[model samples]
Target: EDAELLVTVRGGRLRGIRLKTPGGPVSAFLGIPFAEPPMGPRRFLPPEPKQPWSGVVDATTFQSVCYQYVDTLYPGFEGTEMWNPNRELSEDCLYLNVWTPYPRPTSPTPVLVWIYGGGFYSGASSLDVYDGRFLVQAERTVLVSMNYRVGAFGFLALPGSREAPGNVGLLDQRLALQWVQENVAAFGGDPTSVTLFGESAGAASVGMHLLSPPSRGLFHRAVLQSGAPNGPWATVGMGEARRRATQLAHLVGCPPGGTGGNDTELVACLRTRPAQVLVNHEWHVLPQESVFRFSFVPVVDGDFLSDTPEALINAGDFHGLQVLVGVVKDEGSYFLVYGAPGFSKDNESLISRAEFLAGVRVGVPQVSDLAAEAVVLHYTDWLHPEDPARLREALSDVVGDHNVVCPVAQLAGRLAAQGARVYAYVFEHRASTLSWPLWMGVPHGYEIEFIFGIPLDPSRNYTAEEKIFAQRLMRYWANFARTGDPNEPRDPKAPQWPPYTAGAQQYVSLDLRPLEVRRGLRAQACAFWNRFLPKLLSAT
Candidate 1:
């Protein structure tokens, strides 16, 4: 059969097309504008409809990523040597890509929309790691990845901003989903069977979608990896967010109050400034303070997000969504190499010290010291026996728990209470090909290799056993996507897995040797962390 070629108009732009894949003639479209370029007048505002074009448009290369300080975040990106290299940046970055098995007029496949993560600062659907070929081939699902506004352009909350007041990045995500619902069928995807899955900040974005009204019914299932919905960093309120934005603006040579000048004027001025200039100043003024102090995140604006996700879930929101949530055993090790000093080693001590310092900074008068000590002792006694390194792993888990695990558990509990299905797992197997030297078995994001079924690089090859493990892992994930439940029977070579319930609460433990559910793991610490959350948030 000849390779399939097609073109379609969306958001008023006639996107280009190229569909060549291993499994028969594939159909693909690139750089389709889901929303109008969030530039100029649309800055800081909710996405607007794309303007239609009169003629064919080339969609060959990935469009420029949203106006982001990428060089500072990831040096050597785009081959720049400067800590903050000058690059063409713009707010007109709301673009997405789609790949279909075959864009037949009659067939609509399930849609899997992917959201990439780079701490809400940098990342794009165009990244090589997110290629969806294997998924399209194995599961026959239509795959889509979108670019949302990032960093200051995407999430900044200046006082006089014209755009959506908070979490513009998230709103960009919602608009993309809406676009998918309206236009994906044109590319052979079932609009109604959409599933949202992401990692880290992207996963956190998925959690926000679950809470926002605009995102309801856009996706039926969600996969959250390595991030969750409860913590100081989970979401910020509008007032605090605006204050932070104002502070950042002042640091970047804008007016301190941001109230004296017109919003449009301010935005235009910021846009005209050099990208590296802005990024360098941002880094110098607002250094990476702590993992808990993410500069840009979804805020608790009463209108968009009435309350924190933890409170909302407990109040019976998000009750009927099927969720698959998990975290790695050594999540912090990834952060260590990625600019978090001492995160890989002595993590427990660092966490304890950080918590205490944060509490004092926030003026938690009564239990500040006790809170820090309590958290330290709680995690140490439960997850780590006597190994300091293991304790460090436990601290990473604590970060994951407050930020991702507990929030997910709370969401699952709400769903289970309302008679919905939920499954949970912990990916503990250290990838033989990507294990951190001298660190615990499975570090953060190790499961991505297995879950995505990407082959190990020859230079970083996996053993035969690791390959077998990856196959089993991939099947489990693919099974969950096909059906809400992940407990389908597997080959005898694979381990037996069970569904999660309040009674059993069975959670599959993925390791060198896979097994069903394991109990009595971090129960006390999880409970204490859950209890301490209200107090911590109240302090903020």
Candidate 2:
């Protein structure tokens, strides 16, 4: 009984509790299933409760990741720049991991649930950047990470399919949160004090929870990193999404337009196919069309979502919850390098006749000569007219604004209008080592290095400054998790961040030195986007 470490979940069957660390005993459970494996008939259906286990399960190691394709969409896949040896990939994947300070009999600790992002395609709870050891030790808060379906298995929607609506991936996230509310207390975490946080697609997942009826009352606070609800990339409607899914099904030899039979049978047939076969076939069916590039996202089906998240927030739907929203400075640079090749390397090329012609076939009608000229004129008016880099940045802004920035500002504004505590930030510090051949400024998801407070793996070649930035970021994040405010008197100096308001619209700018509210750069851009968005969305 005196052993510092003991297996409590019984033969590692149901749960595994590890008590490690000198300062305090910590109880951890790894790879506990919250839902039945989404296999066979259950594929594409809402998560079903796990069949109760007869005995305690091993909680020592992480389970496999959900079935997903591996490519540049994920920063680190199979251990390159992004490496986490703890996880593997499998279809039998619906598990969650937890870390909690021991002696749970005492008062409940604030709980933080993390959702990982790989553009809705790949990511796992077992990744190294997500390990909760430091957060538990520093803030004394419980940390939880969960796995959900991804790629075709998660978001595919088709006409007359037996599957539920689109946003199945989001539904899986909601189920994971529900599991935490019911079971986290068993691991010394207070379900009521839960805070949800995520990055990129994970952040977008948090945004979805804000709008979903089922996710209400699950968490008290939310942190969205480098992603937001607005933007063209956000799911628009189920009709087209289903059409895409139908095309994918056809590629896999499942003919469309059968009688409305049990949705279960169709789901079963699709699940039986080999994972690689399905992935390859689906890619062919969902051919990389420009308009559809942002199409394979969570759909705003009438049920899971009542309206577009941005519209919902604007109509005073998402209020009363504490929110922290942010984006990286050069959020689109990564897309330039890794996004579908041949789109555009610079602004001049973006408006060229060849590019314009390419856009017409791909469904981006705005890429025609007239439309492209309009876009150029608009950018020239709003941003610098002569600077080529500025023009590229403007294009990036247009893309990023539609997908990330505008959504964040709109959501924050709505929350603030309803008297909820809201904070906004911009991560802009560019690392020297990060400025490799392809990498320029703070690329998308670049803030993760700072938020996790870890040395960039030697492979990333992060500099000393980057490491210090990481430390500061950890403090700010921990401060917010402890209380609702991120502005704390910490060493290395941080600015006095004010809560966002319509008049002032204060935001923290993380650059060479942490700057308090700069001029309202976002507000001006928001105005321009608000006018252009309707036109852009209408074209589609």
Candidate 3:
């Protein structure tokens, strides 16, 4: 039955799979290359447009994921690709996937391209958990997901080498988005109505694109979930990137400046080494200042990113894209569980720590003993500090607010004040089948399962309560993809979500039945951390 159909793109023709469905079975063109394989001379260099193929290529399967060490990855409970998606590893992993409602709708449809995030290091579009089948069918929207280089292979940047300036990973994503912009028409997708969305580091990438001059018109609306460029771990500076690259060079036996006073020789040596050698010797290139500081992250090369996101946001500098941003109830809990497993109680509660920091440090600079103790006091549970679980929960809240919550709130406030449309929410709905997950609460990425429409697990799906929430969540996401508005035909019975206004500081509380508009989440804690905490520490 050669149900397989073909679509012509910039790279010639692609043979895609028709997913089984009642009406128009979904059409999926998998593993479509978006750029030339980044290898050899191309290592650490910005991505280049892929050459057109001579003939139609079979794209029914996913391409190999970018090289990364599976053993050393921090297996955060929610997203541990662990090389599970595309086990095959290679340096030539610049592919993207497209899923559309089959039979090609009469008119072009809105597109949602997902960029996965594993601390900006590990992710693949082909993960079993990231399939776009249900979302494509439910919303009739074309879904595109892609593979970008991760770990040192992607972010290792030295200095002024047109050969390798940092942010190659970001360029990989920008190029993939460009691919969709140019060729999605053949796949029944509206190039102009593209929405770039992702979780964690992926979400921060959305924020980065918003600020990037090269990515200005690549997308329209952006969805940032549990991440912002302003968030800790989202970015480092050129100095940091260079130092990290140097650090990595030594770890991999490549001496820096060995080529008579320049990084050229070091870079050339790195390029010649087997990609697996770089992948196998995984080390945090970024300077490790505290417990929460990220090892490898996007750096402001004065190109892809001009300055720190906070500074940029302060200057009111960013593309005017309609924004939808939010945080999970307990984002930091995942990291807490990762850093301290002895105390973790719950799927097997998945999981950093610095010596000076008494509590979870969200990449803030080192604090003195008094300041560290004060930080613990600022975010600790007076009543339950002795209880391991309570202390852990407090630590989770402190880090979540300090690292993600307040920074993102600052982002929204600044943008809204600057007259940008912004929608904000907090995902807190939990399924009945889920173990209490008390240790991590509604941790980071808790909402992805619901948003993907898979709920928790296939066998147990969603409990009736979670089912209702999931349906509404999908409807909101789909509607946002279509009209840049999450609320469609406002229901008198349901709570109405308002665009974030300067003083109002409003947000939708996305929970079970108690969903409604709420304000001043972690008011005391966040305000203290956002405002007074700095002054308090500066005094010391």
Candidate 4:
């Protein structure tokens, strides 16, 4: 019985299991190691290739995920954790999962390799919302998701040491991509047709892959949802990386190290500390003013990334792949509910003008008082400062515009400028099942539900209308994975998604209703962020 699901790949044969979905049954092989355990001497280093297994490997179960703190950030009620690690946490968390159509395709089909998002601090492939079966079966594609190190374990960039060089978590992703390229063919997947995609930090990692030389040709197309290579929160410079690493070392009881000899001592001692201590201390490493910023994240190391993302993007140094860029309508609303201390779904608390300026200072860490004043004046409704809903909307726009929405638009435009094929969208649909209050608008990550085909399940309480909307919405993503264009192999009934060019800036409005194609995603706000704010902050 198990022989039918046996798949032979690079690392010996793997025995998978089948799960039934409403559409059909799909075969899943979970926890296939792509790299060796990143522990002991290997901690914080670039991933090493996993050795070949001698016999059949059982991949019927998910394995340990990289260590991370619980994500209470996206809370709906009493400090609830969303996207929490569903599996045991460990240093040996470098596995990948694959979901393919049960009656495997005769000819290889396209592959969608997913990267999960938790602000580069937390998230796991085993999270409930990321299940690949529905999407894979519905789309007739092979879906893969990998677990890479997050937080301090992934991004600790020590100074002057090759052994503990930073961005190894990204290197973990690179190795996984390489694994897909070499082994996906055995699972009825076309390696050359791989579509790399993700949301939030995961999306930013996809953008980073486009710029990295070693990561080139591993994926043919990219879908960046709500993130970009140049996102302010995505990657920091080397000095910042070292500062965080040093602080993390100190927090974990490792002696502070400055020069190369001491740096080796610091990393060696850090390696000896338990992973729980590292994850617990990682957040405390953030500076007081930049509470909103990620403590340990990808850095512009001279090795993996040669220059800043902006500079490289401007110079057209990245691989020119077809890219699909998008952000939700109310991208910032989630942050208000998640990041604000006392804010919650039941509260009608208005954001005070002082808090608005303070948020600008938090969101734009470099903004001078003059720049902060300019930002507040632009976003504020002078007449409705006391109005709770209006103040909430204004504050939401501030957080979303600077962090995600505008940056996504800016990245799409830059790609188009380089003659890269680009398609953009704004996800505006708010599902009836979402727990957040209605005023949250289509907040940061609401699109993922529809994207993953959660509505397809009959018993899940989704409306018939919602199911129909999700089916049509998911086709765009599938079509893109297959042909690098979301509309090709045409769904004649769906609205033709137009190509994004610098002059035109056309983007689809992905509402429960859109078949509407609109031009310029937050054009005014984007102009302020992508054009005006940079210069304003520079002058200060």
Please name the candidate that would achieve the greatest TM-score relative to the true structure.
4
Least well predicted 10-residue stretch by lDDT in candidate 1: 78-87
Best by lDDT: 4
Off by over 4 Å in 1: 1-3, 9-26, 71-90, 102-106, 159-164, 256-272, 283-288, 317-320, 337-367, 381-391, 456-468, 489-496, 511-515, 532-540
Task: Write the number of the candidate with greater TM-score, choosing between 1 and 3.
Answer: 3
- Please report, as a residue range, the 10-residue window in candidate 3 with the lowest summed lDDT: 348-357
**Clashes per model (N, Cα, C within 3 A):** 5, 13, 3, 0
TM-score winner, 2 or 3: 3
lDDT of 3: 0.75
List, residue by residue over 1-540, the lDDT tens digit for candidate 4.
345599888778898999789878999999899999988988988899999989988899888989988765555442235477889888888999999996888798999999999788888998778888889888889999999999988988874588678898999999999999999999899998999999999999999898887897799899999988798899988888888888888787778444343677888888888889888887787865664489888898778888888877888743457999999988887777545533567666466656665666666676677887888788877777666667678878888998998878888898888878999999888888887777787878878889988888776888988888888777889999998898957456656889999899998888768567888989998899899887887774
> Which is better, 2 or 4, measured by lDDT?
4
* Model 1 lDDT per residue over 158-272, tens place: 5435543767788888888988998887777789778888887877888778777768778888887877655445566677677666666666776535456555555655655
> How close to the true structure is residue 18 of candidate 3, measured as C-alpha lDDT?
73
Q: Write the per-residue lDDT of candidate 2 for residues 1-540, one digit (tens) a residue.
A: 223233333113454556444345556677787888877767777787776776656667789988776563445432234533345667788888888655543678788889887677678888767767655655678888989888787887653445645567787888888888877766667777888889988888888888776797788889998776565565657777767766666577664466433445545556677877776665564545543254357877767778877777777644567888888876655554344334433333333333323333343332445555544555564444545445445555555655567667777777888767888898887655453233235777767656754453444566777766766676677677767778785544545888887667878898657566764536766765666645864685
Over 1-540, each residue of candidate 3 has an lDDT whose tens digit, in order, gives 244378888778889887654334688899898889988888888888999998888888888888876643435533343334455888988999999886676698999999897777677887765778777877789899999998887888775777668888998999989998999888789999999998888998888888887886899888989888887678887877777777777777785444542588788877777887876655455334344565568887788878777777888644455788899888777665444444354443222122214444432445556655667777655665565555656667777887788878878878878867888998886555454365566867767777866652345546767766766887888888998888876666766778876678788888776558877546677777778767877884
* lDDT of residue 198 for candidate 3: 89
> Model 1 TM-score?
0.83
Model 4 regions more than 4 Å off: 72-80, 256-261, 317-320, 338-342, 488-491
TM-score of each: 0.83, 0.84, 0.90, 0.96
lDDT of 2 at 244: 72
